[PDB]
Amino acid sequence: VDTCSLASPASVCRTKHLHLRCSVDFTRRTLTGTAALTVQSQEDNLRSLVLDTKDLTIEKVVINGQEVKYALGERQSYKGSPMEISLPIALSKNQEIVIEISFETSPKSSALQWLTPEQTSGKEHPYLFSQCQAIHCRAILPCQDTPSVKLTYTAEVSVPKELVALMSAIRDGETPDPEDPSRKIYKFIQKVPIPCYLIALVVGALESRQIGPRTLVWSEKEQVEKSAYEFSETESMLKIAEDLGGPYVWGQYDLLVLPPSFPYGGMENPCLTFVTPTLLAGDKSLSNVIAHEISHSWTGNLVTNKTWDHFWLNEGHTVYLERHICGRLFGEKFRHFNALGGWGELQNSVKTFGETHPFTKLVVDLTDIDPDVAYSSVPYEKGFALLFYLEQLLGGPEIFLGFLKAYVEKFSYKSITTDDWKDFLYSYFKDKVDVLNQVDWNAWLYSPGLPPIKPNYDMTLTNACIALSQRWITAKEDDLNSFNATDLKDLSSHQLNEFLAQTLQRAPLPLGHIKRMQEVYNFNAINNSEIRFRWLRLCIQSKWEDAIPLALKMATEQGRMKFTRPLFKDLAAFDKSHDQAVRTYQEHKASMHPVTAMLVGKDLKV
Ligand SMILES: COc1cc(O)cc(CCc2ccccc2O)c1
Ligand SMILES: [Yb+3]
């Protein structure tokens, strides 16, 4: 049973399709419209069902052309309020009805950010966007808000005519509003059954330019040139992901580069991946995020996790594919380098939570836990680590990729659990059941802390990062003169970032070493968001006052949670800046993405 959802479970009824016809109102910061759900019954004699809702105003519910009775339950925190609909005629098993619910969103909807014009690049027009992973789709519309249910949908969206609307679906045409000539209706069809966390909307002044045979890049006009350059290897990545995954079943693959308040690096919305504009490093150095979003097209969007207790199935197989893409493009030694960094970030998450803390288990139990609160790098890296370990044990990359394609093939258009994964892994590796029983499964799946085994890693590109970091850390004042900008000359931006990751793991350092590091490396000049973030974290943790305004400036001007939350956290901890960090949050709380705003307020103990 899906514990994070209050709707009737899939064992009762199943949404097959959603028709949504809505209207984006920027004066009220609301979406208003109707959600017509086509619901099949799974039982005999079905007379009622519950849907998920959150801060939605419900005007009425119409089945068979007539208003039916319904009741809203009391709010249950982050879960929202259940919405029971009294059905007018009892359904037999497999009977299908259409429920059309007239609704309105609240401006406080946790799934949406309402951007004023000054918060955009252009400064003339407003912007709005959505993030429904994990359980915020109920903040947009009543639904069975669980990934245990997949549905197709269609939409018609009325927006200011000067604006443009996109969704996670095939764009199905645009027309002016028959009822209101100042507006446009844009239409969307999604023919592939999807879980509702992938429903996506963005409304703004968008421009497009084509970067491949199935890719257009979407953003504000100021951002299109840079976006088209930065993501020009997407077709190449797709061809690899198809060769490893099997056919791409979604048709198009467009990329939308969002404003900086977007809280994730990416979101794998079918046909329209959302990406952070912090990926625009000028050099395609952060292209692995695109490889993560492309990979989700199979592992995530096709093979879906039945519940959020099994999210690792989403992220771990995806991180496994993403590094496989990156491995093709740039070499097997590069895959291992990324893999090893991954274990590095897993070390930090376990250090941060504590090695016995429940969110460090691969499979979590999310009863009474906001998924926004549990979100970490753990499910990505522990999932990846498990799959890497399994690769090595079971005969290396070629064989484990055979398992991975069969896995997509085997579970496409379904929502699975960990036993469904492990059972199939066992059916596939019939001849290696002895190898598999050797694996310690309770530990990998259900024990907290680090995995019980570490897989073998090639060290070739990593050894240079570890060397320079150790040189800095074992340096005493009288060695600091020997550091020089030629220390970095054979370092890729990636090894550089790994050098800072290595160093940050041992923070703090003497103020003097940091001062010197700036002096000869000019890290401050670097605009790569990964490098800068770690360099800034290193400076604040090492107590450098000069870095307060920079780290502050990064924490607010962008809003990617991977960077924003540790920056406010480090700053809260540093005595000299603690009070500016709290006051800066409170100055910008209103203007922040609601989930980011929530997590930073808790992080800051406001
Ligand atoms: C951005 O997508 C998510 C949003 C959330 O609020 C929560 C999640 C996943 C929650 C989760 C699942 C499994 C293991 C750890 C974990 O944090 C994902
Ligand atoms: Yb010395």
Residue numbers in the entry: 4 to 609
Please share text taken word for word from the publication where this structure appeared.
Leukotriene A4 hydrolase (LTA4H) is an enzyme that classically functions as an epoxide hydrolase to generate leukotriene B4 (LTB4) from leukotriene A4 (LTA4)12. Recently, we identified a secondary anti-inflammatory activity for LTA4H whereby it functions as an aminopeptidases to degrade the tripeptide Pro-Gly-Pro (PGP). The enzyme itself is folded into 3 domains, which manifest as N-terminal, catalytic and C-terminal domains.
The origins of the augmented capacity of compound 9 to inhibit LTA4H epoxide hydrolase activity were explored by modelling and X-ray crystallography. The X-ray structure of LTA4H shows high similarity to literature examples (RMSD between 606 atom pairs is 0.204 Å). Whilst 2H-resveratrol forms two interactions with Trp-311, one H-bond and one π-stack, these are absent in the compound 9 structure, where the 3-methoxy-5-phenol ring rotates to allow the phenol to H-bond to Asp-375. Importantly, previous site-directed mutational interrogation of the active site of the enzyme has identified Asp-375 to be the only residue uniquely and absolutely required for the enzyme’s epoxide hydrolase activity. This therefore likely underlies the far superior capacity of compound 9 versus 2H-resveratrol to inhibit that capacity of LTA4H to generate LTB4. Thus compound 9 represented a chemical series with clear and rational potential to selectively inhibit the epoxide hydrolase activity of LTA4H. Compound 9 exhibited sub-μM capacity to inhibit LTB4 generation in a cell based assay, whilst showing no inhibition of PGP degradation at 100 μM – thus exhibiting a superior selectivity to ARM1 in our hands.
